[PDB]
Design a binder for this molecule. Structure first.
Ligand SMILES: Nc1nc(=S)[nH]c2[nH]ncc12
Length: 284
């Protein structure tokens, strides 16, 4: 299984689809996205990779995206899917059962608190209960069939709050806030904790990382990353976290760091073929 990077940003929005193998270290280049996008999210349902939302920043325009697009790794082809009800740049995305949840994001000055659900087998989106908060640059993660929206930006304030979506009830409820304000952090599930790595707090990009334990309902810092980064890509592969690219306040990183929880340590594991931020990332 590989870690896929889709889209991203470096001087403009990118179409690159590339896969890194932490086992042999190789980067293999696959089919370009139909439309370049940064600020998108990636996920996998039934082994198919989806690209959700984002934005095409080019010298000729800046268009937020409603597009959902699907990649088959054995056939190397993108297929357009039904679009969301609104464009969602800097979207968050999570998967519960077999449905794709599109969370937050922006459309111009509009900062969404709305959430939509996609059924890959029916190719339909439907609006779901909105969050308590407007959130662009939000991290989304799923634990025990529960959907977490973590941090982000409401248009005026960067956020340390997190809220939890209950599918059976169709309602959101706040949880304990993170210790650190973070928009554009990488958010994932590793074991039985929600991790939030990096981001931007409104003054600096962050290298700190913290994790949420649902049993105790508390957030705890762990070892920081080596590079401060916002708008990083994050995923979990064989019980380890990977962060891909991002921005440190000066440069777009190609650095890829890997966190080992048993040792609570980060190590640089590779460089992307080119620096970028705002990628979608998933594993299949
Ligand atoms: N790196 C940054 N991330 C966010 S979300 N906002 C920012 N303003 N200026 C830098 C950044």
């Amino acid at each position: 299984r590989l870690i896929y990077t889709a889209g991203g940003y470096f001087r403009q929005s990118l179409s690159y689809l590339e896969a890194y193998n932490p086992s042999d270290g190789t980067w293999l280049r696959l089919a370009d996205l139909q439309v370049p996008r940064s600020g998108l999210a990636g996920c996998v349902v039934g082994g198919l990779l989806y690209a959700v939302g984002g934005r095409n920043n080019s010298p000729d325009g800046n268009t937020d995206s409603s597009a959902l697009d699907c990649y088959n790794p054995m056939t190397n082809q993108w297929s357009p899917c039904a679009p969301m009800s609104v464009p969602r740049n800097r979207i968050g995305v999570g998967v519960i059962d077999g449905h794709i949840y599109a969370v937050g994001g922006s459309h111009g000055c509009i900062h969404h608190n709305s959430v939509e659900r996609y059924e890959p087998e029916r190719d339909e989106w439907h609006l779901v209960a909105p969050m308590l908060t407007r959130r662009i640059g939000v991290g989304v993660a799923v634990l025990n069939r529960l959907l977490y929206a973590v941090g982000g930006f409401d248009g005026t304030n960067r956020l340390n709050s997190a809220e939890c979506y209950y599918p059976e009830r169709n309602e959101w409820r706040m949880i304990t806030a993170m210790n650190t304000i973070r928009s554009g952090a990488g958010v994932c599930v590793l074991h039985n904790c929600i991790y939030a790595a990096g981001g931007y707090d409104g003054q600096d990009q962050l290298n700190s990382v913290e994790r949420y334990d649902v049993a105790t309902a508390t957030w705890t810092f762990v070892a920081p990353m080596k590079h401060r980064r916002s708008a990083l890509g994050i995923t979990v592969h064989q019980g380890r976290i990977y962060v891909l690219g991002g921005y440190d306040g000066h440069t777009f990183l190609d650095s890829v760091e890997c966190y080992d929880p048993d040792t609570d340590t980060w190590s640089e594991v590779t460089r992307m073929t080119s620096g970028r931020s705002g990628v979608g990332v998933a594993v299949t």
